[PDB]
Design a binder for this molecule. Structure first.
Ligand SMILES: O=C(NC(=O)c1ccccc1)N[C@@H]1O[C@H](CO)[C@@H](O)[C@H](O)[C@H]1O
Ligand SMILES: O=C(NC(=O)c1ccccc1)N[C@@H]1O[C@H](CO)[C@@H](O)[C@H](O)[C@H]1O
Ligand SMILES: O=C(NC(=O)c1ccccc1)N[C@@H]1O[C@H](CO)[C@@H](O)[C@H](O)[C@H]1O
Ligand SMILES: O=C(NC(=O)c1ccccc1)N[C@@H]1O[C@H](CO)[C@@H](O)[C@H](O)[C@H]1O
Ligand SMILES: *Cc1c(COP(=O)(O)O)cnc(C)c1O
Ligand SMILES: *Cc1c(COP(=O)(O)O)cnc(C)c1O
Lengths: 807, 807
């Protein structure tokens, strides 16, 4: 049926009986009242049972061997569903498929019942999830530490073409994958004041909040390793009577909901609390575990802490506090230890996203940390002054403390000073960090800066979501590639294979028919599966330029209306993604997209030649559906703005061709497959700079491109908003007078490049041959490679593909 | 080892393997890291497994047979622990005892780890719990419906002699006995307004709160019947963004905490919400189940709703609303149905406890219900006027609407008008209801009023907490008495048995040594196990007169100090109980008790002759410990104030002699054992009335009793509060000028009667012979008898002791 593992007779028999056991004793049901949901739970519990043995031995192994431990701190872990992923990594997929079949059930139907663990916004959260999977697969003693939000990323509903946010109550029916561990609850302190007494400072009169951990297993791919992801939950201590207990919820609000802010840094107190909460509980856990393994000289040899962005940056001053205040280590010794164990990863260069906490906030909530931060700053600036004597301006630029309206702490500067390694997430992004944003720091300590180009896990993003494609590949080169993606290169020798070409093209057509069906089943819309599937799915941001895509779509529509009887390659263009609740422009763009579809999708002259569809509630489980069905992947951010991107890598691995700018990882992807096999266009980072020196004037482009001018006039006159003629004045206004992302500047080259895409699509054989060359060269983008580099170049540990001594 | 069931070889083997299974797969632990708590959980899960089969068939049986269903509505269910009770009713106690032994564990030690399900204040809540056990044992298709508070009755801590309230976070480590059933969540409405349109009224614009049920099994005694207790949990519907989700907690606060108010009716909105919440969700569930079994003519033949006090009284107007508004039945037909299915139980005659809801509250929160209540009142008063023409005063006295300062709805009058049966909980209490409080209603419909004297379950209150006593009894008369307590009478023929007398006396001494030890182990205090154990345990109330007990204790102390070298029967007097947080006087009494102990317990002249101990955090699990170890049970409420009492019955069944007034069930207890075998004293209900006509003047008693005057002067001068001389001025002030409970009036007779108790205690043989006569005549007070009467005289169903077709 596929290489989803063997379906042993004894194995299938055992599975079936355990399914019935759980249905009875665990769910307390019987075949006569069980709903599909109960069936899903019976299966989840049966599968989950196979993890227990491995989980216990893995943790036991690490105890005996005592290897260096990797702690990945993130406020986000975009996990998605875990039933199928668990079956895959355990080689249980076919056995469970058979067993449920014999029990008279459809496994695929049951899998659709599981809720997505949406504890992330997008790329950054999903990277942590892919990293966890790779770390387990490479046998690293790694622990993912975060917050267990009871409400993850909101569920997106489109009402009248507008986005509506709805609470994502993912724990409503329970989470069978987690294991509450109240025996390990730890106390976290807030507020209070600092007392300076004879022997050291003392943080007193603090308000206490408890951190209760919940452990979720993270299985490696067929190696019997099961690592742990520990998520903290806020609990009030039990020490008007009614009001007093009702007010417990104020302390527990800390882990209540994931902040959905993608673009702008707000600076809310609840978020700072969430950040200290995960940091404070995690460090106690880390040190406790270390004390078991007091000379902290060996701390860095046994501990590695990776900070996913600046969100968990308080780990630096908190490690110092514990080491200096509680362990009584001298400052210098404590600082040496801290720097050697901490490493920081940056994910963007846009200023509005940078965390710059008001000093008055830190002063009230974490008084001792502010004192430590000031001391760190003092000593750091003393180092700078000694290296660049008299460079008074460098001193103010490099300070962790920013003066002005209100004093703030630049968390990024804090992270650089307190880490032995700082990395970008794509070659071009890492270069930009050295050349611009962190130039001063790079000059001071060049050795700290590195690059670790992002990657995605081939298990979830190939084997799991595209079994058909994974099968035909395995049919030719074997299975070894699933944990060694570079082997995909061997597929180059089949680029002229008439059989393979036919197969590659066949799985894509099956994937498109499957998606086209799902679109009607759960959303009733109907699309032509013979058209080119043009998709752009990712969070809505101005820098991602969904607007540029919109301009092209309107252009295509305008050309058809001009020459109705001229042939054009049919296209179904799908755009999907969530907008941060307070991001007005982003919400206005979602409205534009739906407004375009209302005109285009109901124009009789257009027929089934052009369809504009907005994919509702884009999330991990939906991505697993659309991506394998896409023909064209849109990665069109303004050069220099997308640090890396990862959706781009997911499309490449699944047989879609890419049209994009030389931004983020796009650069390395084109470099791997060859620019001839990529649809590159638009300004490069340098062209953007040149335009900036000159001054970007959108009017110029409006005046010289008739097709563009016509589009803008359609928007202004209410062509796409009859009842509300001026509905889109904000978008037009932005495009013409304050477009930081130069949408117009790339319009002409984008449209022309899109014409070349349509031309190639007209030649099935050649389109597929180009696809084969993309899939065959996507090996570099596996997160196994990324993690192997982090392991070797930052953490100081050697990855191992050695199977663990059976379960 | 005892008749705790057989310990079969196969049974013990199976238990052990399932214990290890759960420890591994359920707890995800291994013998090397498991804590006693894990062991308890492994056992709880193993035992719980045996309930599943029976639970499913029982519910299945009721579906096929379709018997009349009994719904017991209560806002309280004081369950206590359920591990041992489950083993007992399933005859698994010895088998589990053996199995854990072989696994190298002490079952008794593990049992002590389980938390008490304290979802009740005292008597009323515990009665619901005993009733559930009896209903299952008598094979009635009964369902207990209530609220799943996440915080039950507060844990009592004594600080400096003062009570401190601490949140009872009983779900912290989880509840293995419940089963969440989200597939049955129901919506409950609040606020809104009423719209009168063409065809009927309509409740619109309501705020919605969801009710998620949690089911807990209730096993009958060895009959394989497992009924259900369904507890509702408040959940907000998922339909600033952050603030919006953080504000979900306002809806979920409904099921957050149990109101600890024992004595005074506050009238808080949160409590009214809790009351409508349980009523609204329960009725939907009831009607849904009925529709499966539309002529509601047969509704009363298939449904019986028992209201535990007036707390769930909104069930009456809510049944009407549904029937009239939704089902469209005519009023009269709907009213006939409602009255025939509802029955009300009263638990007190004190005015301050009566629920009288302000009309403005009902107007805002439940507008339609207020309209229905006014209509019910109108028609009822029309009935009264027709029966007693011209009795204009009777009309105002009987109205459900009370005029005055603020209009209120008398929920008790509502319950009488809408129920076909109203009952008191003890013969004397039920008589008082007819003669006083509900005289007007009794005259209107004499047939409605009944009596159902309370009872306790012999499984929990004998077999479970006193296995030693249960064993020696079974040794002579068999085991049949455990579900037929009347058989205890057969013990009368052993009253002269030298062996039995020795045995009865022996188990009591073992129980006292066990308790004396526990007192030192968990509370470090040390008491003489040879002294008479004088105990008064129950909630602190002025009417219960813990103060009268205090006066006696001080008197004993004063007599010893007067004649130090005179012999006196040594006594350890223990007083325990929780005070409602806002009950100042009650908290002042707790302070007095501890203050007395501070003087008495450290006076060298007193030695081990007198010990005053305040039992901290009295609760169900503690009662199971003290009661079997008591010699003297104090039931001294002012005649006519304690509706029934149940702690009194627990002491009688466990070999303690009773000293009390002719109040509540005390009357029937003395009547059953013979007044010669009871220590009765003080005023009878009539004497209290006479005193009231005359006028109670405490000064009179103060002036004529020197011993009493001396005690009051000691309190006033600061003898018991050196540092704060006037600490107890409020108590003295109350005693002298506003004692509604005439403490002084019963002082002399109480002290004399206590002398007779001491005299008998000096004669071991005769004391024990009297004990045998009490235990032998306690059969009437089993809740099996009570339930059989409710079943037959109110619900219309026949109890059955028939075993259900195996598991
Ligand atoms: O929540 C879990 N999770 C797991 O057992 C588990 C096992 C393997 C992998 C992931 C989760 N278990 C739960 O632990 C509580 C407390 O011990 C039990 O009462 C409950 O019945 C059980 O399902
Ligand atoms: O997703 C984010 N950032 C956030 O989601 C975020 C969350 C909270 C606050 C600010 C930003 N960054 C993204 O991280 C991925 C993985 O490195 C990159 O490939 C991508 O280019 C970048 O934009
Ligand atoms: O909470 C219970 N309770 C019982 O199974 C039970 C069984 C018999 C008697 C009392 C409770 N079961 C729980 O039900 C959830 C949802 O199905 C599972 O995920 C969890 O593992 C299981 O322990
Ligand atoms: O316990 C209560 N009442 C409360 O706990 C209570 C709770 C909330 C509000 C008012 C009273 N009443 C008690 O109920 C038992 C059982 O019928 C009687 O034996 C006892 O005499 C009576 O006082
Ligand atoms: C991969 C992924 C992302 C990241 O997409 P980019 O195009 O890199 O922004 C965001 N959301 C989901 C659900 C993903 O699967
Ligand atoms: C039996 C019981 C009660 C009732 O006691 P009374 O003496 O009738 O007031 C109260 N609390 C607990 C814990 C009980 O077990």
């Amino acid at each position: 049926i596929s290489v989803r593992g063997l379906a042993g007779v004894e194995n299938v028999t055992e599975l079936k009986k355990n399914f019935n056991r759980h249905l009875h004793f665990t769910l307390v049901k019987d075949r006569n009242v069980a709903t599909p949901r109960d069936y899903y739970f019976a299966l989840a519990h049966t599968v989950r049972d196979h993890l227990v043995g491995r989980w216990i031995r893995t943790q036991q192994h690490y105890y005996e061997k005592d290897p260096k431990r990797i702690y990945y701190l993130s406020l986000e872990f975009y996990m998605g569903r875990t039933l199928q992923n668990t079956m895959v990594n355990l080689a249980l997929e076919n056995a469970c498929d058979e067993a449920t079949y014999q029990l008279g059930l459809d496994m695929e139907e049951l899998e659709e019942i599981e809720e997505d663990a949406g504890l992330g916004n997008g790329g950054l959260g999903r990277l942590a999830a892919c990293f966890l999977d790779s770390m387990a697969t490479l046998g690293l003693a790694a622990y993912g530490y975060g917050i267990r939000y009871e409400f993850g990323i909101f569920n997106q509903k489109i009402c009248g073409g507008w986005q509506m946010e709805e609470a994502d109550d993912w724990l409503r029916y329970g989470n069978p994958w987690e294991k509450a561990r109240p025996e390990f609850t730890l106390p976290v302190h807030f507020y209070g004041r600092v007392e300076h007494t004879s022997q050291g400072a003392k943080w007193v009169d603090t308000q206490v909040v408890l951190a209760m951990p919940y452990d979720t297993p993270v299985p490696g791919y067929r190696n019997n390793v099961v690592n742990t992801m520990r998520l903290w939950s806020a609990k009030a201590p039990n020490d008007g009577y009614i009001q007093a207990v009702l007010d417990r919820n104020l302390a527990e609000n800390i882990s209540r909901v994931l902040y959905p802010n993608d673009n702008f840094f707000e600076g809310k107190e609840l978020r700072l609390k969430q950040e200290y909460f995960v940091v404070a509980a995690t460090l106690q856990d880390i040190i406790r575990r270390f004390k078991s393994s007091t000379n902290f000289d060996a701390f860095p040899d046994k501990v590695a802490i990776q900070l996913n962005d600046t969100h968990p940056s308080l780990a630096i001053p908190e490690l110092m506090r514990v080491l200096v205040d509680l362990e009584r280590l001298d400052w210098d010794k404590a600082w040496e230890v801290t720097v050697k164990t901490c490493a920081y990863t940056n994910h963007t260069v846009i200023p509005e996203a940078l965390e710059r906490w008001p000093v008055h906030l830190l002063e009230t909530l974490l008084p001792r940390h502010l004192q430590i931060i000031y001391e760190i700053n003092q000593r750091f600036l003393n180092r700078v002054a000694a290296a660049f004597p008299g460079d008074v301006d460098r001193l103010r630029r490099m300070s962790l403390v920013e003066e002005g309206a209100v004093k703030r702490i630049n968390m990024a500067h804090l992270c650089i000073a307190g880490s032995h390694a700082v990395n970008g997430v794509a070659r071009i992004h890492s270069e930009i960090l050295k050349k611009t944003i962190f130039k001063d720091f790079y000059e001071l300590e060049p050795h700290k800066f590195q690059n670790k180009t992002n990657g995605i896990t081939p298990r979830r993003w190939l084997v799991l979501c595209n079994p058909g494609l994974a099968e035909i590949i395995a049919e030719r080169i074997g299975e070894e590639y699933i944990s060694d993606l570079d082997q995909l290169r061997k597929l180059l020798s089949y680029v002229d294979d008439e059989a393979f070409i036919r197969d590659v093209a066949k799985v894509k057509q099956e994937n498109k028919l499957k998606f086209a069906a799902y679109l009607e089943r759960e959303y009733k819309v109907h699309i032509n599966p013979n058209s080119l599937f043009d998709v752009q799915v990712k969070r809505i941001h101005e820098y991602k330029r969904q607007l540029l895509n919109c301009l092209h779509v309107i252009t295509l529509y305008n050309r058809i209306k001009k020459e109705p009887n001229k042939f054009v390659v049919p296209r179904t263009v799908m755009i999907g993604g969530k907008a941060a609740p307070g991001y007005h422009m982003a919400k206005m763009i979602i409205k534009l997209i739906t407004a375009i579809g209302d005109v285009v999708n109901h124009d009789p002259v257009v027929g089934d030649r052009l369809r504009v569809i907005f994919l509702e509630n884009y999330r991990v489980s939906l991505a697993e559906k659309v991506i394998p069905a896409a023909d064209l992947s849109e990665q069109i951010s303004t050069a220099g703005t997308e640090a890396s991107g990862t959706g781009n890598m997911k499309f490449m691995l699944n047989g879609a061709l890419t049209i994009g700018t030389m931004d983020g990882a796009n650069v390395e992807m084109a470099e791997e497959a060859g620019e001839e096999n990529f649809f590159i266009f638009g300004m490069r980072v340098e062209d953007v700079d040149r335009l900036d020196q000159r001054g970007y004037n959108a009017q110029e482009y409006y005046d010289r491109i008739p097709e563009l001018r016509q589009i803008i006039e359609q928007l202004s006159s209410g062509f796409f908003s009859p009842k509300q003629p001026d509905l889109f004045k904000d978008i037009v206004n932005m495009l013409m007078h304050h477009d930081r992302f130069k949408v117009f500047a790339d319009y002409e080259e984008y449209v022309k490049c899109q014409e070349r895409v349509s031309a190639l699509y007209k030649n099935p054989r050649e389109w597929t041959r180009m696809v084969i060359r993309n899939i065959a060269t996507s090996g570099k983008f596996s997160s196994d490679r990324t993690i192997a580099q982090y392991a070797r170049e930052i953490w100081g540990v050697e990855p191992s593909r050695q199977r663990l001594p059976a379960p």
